């Protein structure tokens, strides 16, 4: 009824004329994701990637890798002898690392505003899982288990070569000895390994068992929307290497005039870029390459130069500047001084009047990210703000830094899988253009001076 519209996010909220003594309160039960499985089964890979995705869509998540606690408490690894089930002391130290991590999990979800905590450890015995469940119950946390099962020696071997040998645990080993040591290490866990049994012993646990690197899944009792989204995500990512290229439309006429938004066409240089891009793509020599564009002219003209089939996504259209569309930043500053200042102070959350914020962009791009995960080689031709958002996802950049990432015209960002993340290579196609990047740029108000 009598509402007021927040200046930054433009959200209508009830006016709350605070009383003489305003009161606060202080400030959707948080969840503990329990990874399960033998070493070299992708638990850490899954932990980091899912966390990258959840934080990007706005769900504060953090990984608690018990291995890092262990490496912190023991300083330098020597051999798998540390992981022998008959190693009483180590068993004690490992359990203490687990409890220390849970201690931090508790502090994260109950005191730091965290919503999802990913507990990354083997948790291969029913007893250890029972303990974690107890910890969850007593703290009012939900528990969701993600078990990765892989009986393909080729996959295990490959996993060891990709992230284990170059691990700091093996800084003093060559590949062969590191490989040999890790296999012995894995065998240490095999005797006591009790996989999740949803059809019996674990009938009441909320879980997903990932099998054969995502070929088959067993899902038991999803409890809410967050677990729902987690399962959807897990079931649509794969590990086969591929390449994602990101770039903007070639320079357009509005760029030349310093005007934002709009649907202008390529400038003469933008067209030169489009040709260069075709030459670039050709040289990458990719068997298959999917091309995606927004539904705005400039990206489409750019794709036409490639002589390849392309698909238009309205979701890739540039951020909508609302009433500031078609204006120059100078005209925005002069015509809407307050809006200009508000955006400068909170570029990620700020929403243009009748328009969007980077936050809105992210929500809009969720489907693009999910489909990108399903794809192989793909080239996305988009716009500045959109590219920053997609780049933030791939490079795990925060919301605060997202609106300022540098994504220049006529430059391809080549992303490739490396270990637990993505490597980025910048390739400028040598065609001039303007620069659309803009960095982050009192006295009288104090005396003297659900599921």
Ligand X SMILES: Nc1ncnc2c1ncn2[C@@H]1O[C@H](COP(=O)(O)OP(=O)(O)O)[C@@H](O)[C@H]1O
Ligand Y SMILES: O=P(O)(O)OC[C@H]1O[C@](O)(CO)[C@@H](O)[C@@H]1O
Q: Contacts with ligand X in 23-82 (CB under 6 A)? A: 37, 39-46
Q: Does residue 48 bind ligand Y (CB under 6 A)?
A: no
Cβ 188 to ligand X shortest distance, Å: 13
Q: Is 70 annotated as a binding residue?
A: yes
**Would you list the DSSP string of 309-354?**
-EEE-GGGS----GGGTT-BHHHHHHH-HHHHHHHHH-TTT---TT
Find out whether 338 and 328 touch, Cβ atoms under 8 Å.
no
Q: Reduced to 3 states, what is the DSSP secondary structure of residue 231?
A: helix
Q: Which is nearer to ligand Y, 379 or 386 (CB)?
A: 386
- Contacts with 123 (C-beta within 8 Å, 6 or more apart), sequence order: 34, 35, 36, 129, 132
- Of 69 and 292, which CB lies nearer to ligand X in the complex structure? 69
> At its nearest, how many Å lie between ligand Y and the CB of residue 401?
13
Query: Which of the choices ligand X, ligand Y, ligand EDT, none does residue 150 contact, using the CB cut-off of 5 to 8 A by kind?
Result: ligand X
Find out whether 42 is annotated in a ligand binding site.
yes
x/- map, 191-220, ligand X, by CB under 6 A: -------------------x--xx------
Q: What is the 3-state secondary structure (H, E, C) of 113-132?
A: CCCEEEEECCCCCHHHHHHH
Q: According to the binding rule CB under 6 A, does residue 267 interact with ligand EDT?
A: no
- Mapped onto helix, strand or coil, the DSSP state of residue 35 is strand
**Position among 32, 188, 247, 319 found at the interface with ligand Y (CB under 6 A):** 319
Query: In angstroms, rounded to a whole number, what is the distance separating the alpha carbons of residues 69 and 66?
Result: 5
The residue behind tokens 């062969």 is 176
User: Shortest gap between Cβ of 240 and ligand X (angstroms)?
Assistant: 9
Rounded to 5°, the CA angle 136-139-140 comes to 80
43 in a labelled binding site? yes
Smallest gap from residue 97 Cβ to ligand EDT (A): 7
Restricted to residues 388-427, the positions that interact with ligand Y (CB under 6 A) are: 403
Quote the least distance from Cβ 43 to ligand EDT, whole Å.
6
Minimum CB distance to ligand X smaller for 44 or for 359: 44
Nearest distance from C-beta of residue 116 to ligand EDT, angstroms: 18
Q: Per CB under 6 A, does 357 bind ligand X?
A: no
Residue among 347, 366, 367, 368 at smallest CA distance from 358: 347
> Do the beta carbons of residue 368 and residue 378 sit within 8 Å?
no
Q: Which is nearer to ligand X, 84 or 297 (CB)?
A: 84
Is position 388 annotated in a ligand binding site? yes
Euclidean distance between CA atoms 54 and 28, whole angstroms: 15
Strand partners of residue 12: 5
Whether the Cβ atoms of residue 15 and residue 2 lie closer than 8 Å to each other: yes
Q: Taking CB within 5 to 8 Å according to partner kind, which of ligand X, ligand EDT, ligand Y, none is near residue 162? A: ligand X
CA distance 425 to 413: 6
- Per-residue contact string for residues 96-135; x = within reach of ligand EDT by CB under 6 A: ------------------------xxx-------------
Q: Which positions lie near ligand X, rule CB under 6 A?
A: 37, 39-46, 148, 150, 155, 159, 162-163, 210, 213-214, 239
Interface with ligand Y by CB under 6 A: which residues? 255, 260-261, 318-319, 321, 383-385, 403, 436, 438
């Amino acid at each position: 009824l009598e509402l007021t519209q927040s200046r930054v996010q433009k959200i209508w909220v009830p006016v709350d004329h605070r009383p003489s003594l305003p009161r606060s309160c202080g400030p959707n039960s948080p969840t503990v994701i329990v990874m399960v499985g033998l070493p070299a089964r992708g638990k850490t890979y899954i932990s980091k990637k899912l966390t990258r995705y959840l934080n990007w869509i706005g769900v504060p998540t953090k990984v608690f890798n018990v291995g890092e606690y262990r490496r912190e408490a023991v300083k330098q690894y020597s051999s798998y002898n540390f992981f022998r089930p008959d190693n009483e002391e180590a068993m004690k130290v490992r359990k203490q690392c687990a409890l220390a991590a849970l201690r931090d999990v508790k502090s994260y979800l109950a005191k730091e505003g965290g919503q999802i905590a990913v507990f990354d450890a083997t948790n291969t015995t029913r007893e250890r899982r029972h303990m974690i469940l107890h910890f969850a119950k007593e703290n009012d946390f939900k528990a969701f288990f993600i078990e990765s099962v892989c009986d393909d020696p080729t996959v295990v071997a490959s996993n060891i070569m990709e992230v284990k040998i170059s691990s700091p645990d093996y800084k003093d080993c060559n590949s062969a000895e590191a490989m040999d040591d890790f296999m012995k290490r894995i065998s240490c866990y095999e005797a006591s390994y009790q996989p999740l049994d949803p059809d019996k012993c674990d009938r009441d646990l909320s879980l997903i068992k990932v099998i054969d690197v995502g070929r088959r899944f067993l899902v038991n009792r999803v409890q809410d929307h967050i677990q729902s989204r987690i399962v959807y995500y897990l079931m649509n990512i794969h590990v086969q290497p591929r390449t994602i290229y990101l770039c903007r439309h070639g320079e357009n006429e509005h760029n030349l005039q310093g005007r934002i938004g709009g649907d202008s066409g390529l400038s003469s240089r933008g067209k030169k870029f489009a040709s260069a891009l075709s030459k670039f793509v050709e040289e990458q020599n990719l068997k298959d390459l999917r091309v995606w564009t927004s539904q705005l002219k400039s990206t489409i003209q750019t794709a036409e130069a490639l002589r390849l089939p392309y698909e238009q996504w309205k979701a890739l259209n540039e951020i909508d500047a609302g009433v500031c569309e078609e204006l120059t930043y100078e005209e925005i500053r002069d015509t809407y001084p307050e809006e200009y200042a508000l955006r400068e102070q909170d570029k990620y959350y700020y929403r243009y009047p009748t328009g969007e914020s980077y936050q809105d962009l992210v929500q809009r791009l969720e489907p693009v990210i999910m489909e990108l995960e399903r794809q192989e080689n793909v080239l996305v031709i988009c716009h500045q703000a959109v590219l920053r958002c997609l780049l933030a996802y791939f490079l795990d950049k925060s919301a605060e830094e997202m609106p300022y990432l540098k994504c220049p015209l006529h430059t391809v960002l080549k992303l490739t899988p490396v270990a637990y993340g993505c490597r980025v290579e910048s390739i400028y196609l040598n065609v001039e253009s303007v620069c659309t990047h803009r960095e982050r740029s009192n006295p009288l108000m104090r005396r003297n001076s659900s599921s």
